[PDB]
């Protein structure tokens, strides 16, 4: 389904997971865990990630509407 790949998006600007996680208000381990296939971020949080990260939601988490 949804492909979690913030790190690519974040690392695009060389954004730190730690700072980003601070931006998200969530633990870094969890955020980097999601790419690894851990349960994707919540409805608002994904929106926040796009907002905090400043990137389309699709790039960070391509919904892949199956």
UniProtKB/TrEMBL annotation:
<keyword id="KW-0614">Plasmid</keyword>
<protein>
    <submittedName>
        <fullName>CylR2</fullName>
    </submittedName>
</protein>
<dbReference type="InterPro" id="IPR010982">
    <property type="entry name" value="Lambda_DNA-bd_dom_sf"/>
</dbReference>
<dbReference type="GO" id="GO:0003677">
    <property type="term" value="F:DNA binding"/>
</dbReference>
<dbReference type="Pfam" id="PF01381">
    <property type="entry name" value="HTH_3"/>
</dbReference>
<feature type="domain" description="HTH cro/C1-type">
    <location>
        <begin position="6"/>
        <end position="60"/>
    </location>
</feature>
<dbReference type="InterPro" id="IPR001387">
    <property type="entry name" value="Cro/C1-type_HTH"/>
</dbReference>
<keyword id="KW-0238">DNA-binding</keyword>
